[PDB]
Structures are given as structure tokens and as C-alpha cells.
């Protein structure tokens, strides 16, 4: 779960 | 690695609407459970902050 992610998850 | 027919249609729609390339559009949808409304909200939030990487909008 490293780096850029979209939304609140 | 591949998308269902329904996901493929969602992807094309979201890429057009957001202005992101297909791979970053797929990333946003996957990050948001293939939930278009949620994805659009999430995108708009991050876009306003100036935080989406510029590579997301390149062809």
C-alpha cells in the first residue's frame, strides 16, 4: 500500500 | 490484469470524464471498489489539492 492512492480506503 | 465488460465500460467513461489516462483511471476505480460515484468524488478531492501526479494526465 505504498505510493499514491485515490479515495479514503 | 484484465477488466470485465462492465469494468471496461466504466474505465473508458471515467478516463474521458477525469482527463486521466486509462492506467491511472483504472487505478482510481480499483482504489475505490469500481464505484463510479465514489471514484469521482475521490478524484475531485485530490485534483483540487494539486496532489494527483502530473503523469496521470499524460497520454
From Swiss-Prot, chain B:
Every copy of the TAP-C domain together lies at 5-59
Q: Which domain of life is it from?
A: Eukaryota
What happens after mutating residue 57 to A?
Suppresses FG-nucleoporin binding
Q: Where in the cell is it found?
A: Nucleus; Nucleus, Nucleoplasm; Nucleus speckle; Nucleus, Nuclear pore complex
Q: How does it assemble?
A: Heterodimer (via NTF2 domain) with NXT1. The formation of NXF1-NXT1 heterodimers is required for the NXF1-mediated nuclear mRNA export. Forms a complex with RANBP2/NUP358, NXT1 and RANGAP1. Associates with the exon junction complex (EJC) and with the transcription/export (TREX) complex. Found in a mRNA complex with UPF3A and UPF3B. Found in a post-splicing complex with RBM8A, UPF1, UPF2, UPF3A, UPF3B and RNPS1. (Microbial infection) Interacts with Saimiriine herpesvirus 2 TIP protein.
* Entry note about domains: The minimal CTE binding domain consists of an RNP-type RNA binding domain (RBD) and leucine-rich repeats. The nucleoporin binding domain consists of a NTF2 domain (also called NTF2-like domain) and a TAP-C domain (also called UBA-like domain). It has 2 nucleoporin-FG-repeats binding sites (one in the NTF2 and the other in the TAP-C domain) which contribute to nucleoporin association and act synergistically to export cellular mRNAs.
Q: What job does the chain carry out?
A: Involved in the nuclear export of mRNA species bearing retroviral constitutive transport elements (CTE) and in the export of mRNA from the nucleus to the cytoplasm (TAP/NFX1 pathway). The NXF1-NXT1 heterodimer is involved in the export of HSP70 mRNA in conjunction with ALYREF/THOC4 and THOC5 components of the TREX complex. ALYREF/THOC4-bound mRNA is thought to be transferred to the NXF1-NXT1 heterodimer for export.
Annotated family: Belongs to the NXF family.
Protein name as annotated: Nuclear RNA export factor 1
What is the source species?
A: Homo sapiens
Name the gene: NXF1
Residue numbers of the full-length protein present here: 561 to 619 of 619
Amino acid at each position: 500500500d505504498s505510493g499514491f492512492s485515490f479515495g479514503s480506503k | 490484469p484484465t477488466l470485465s465488460p462492465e469494468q471496461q465500460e466504466m474505465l473508458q467513461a471515467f478516463s474521458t470524464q477525469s482527463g486521466m489516462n486509462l492506467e491511472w483511471s483504472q487505478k482510481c476505480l480499483q482504489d475505490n471498489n469500481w464505484d463510479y460515484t465514489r471514484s469521482a468524488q475521490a478524484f475531485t478531492h485530490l485534483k483540487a489539492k494539486g496532489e494527483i501526479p502530473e503523469v496521470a494526465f499524460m497520454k
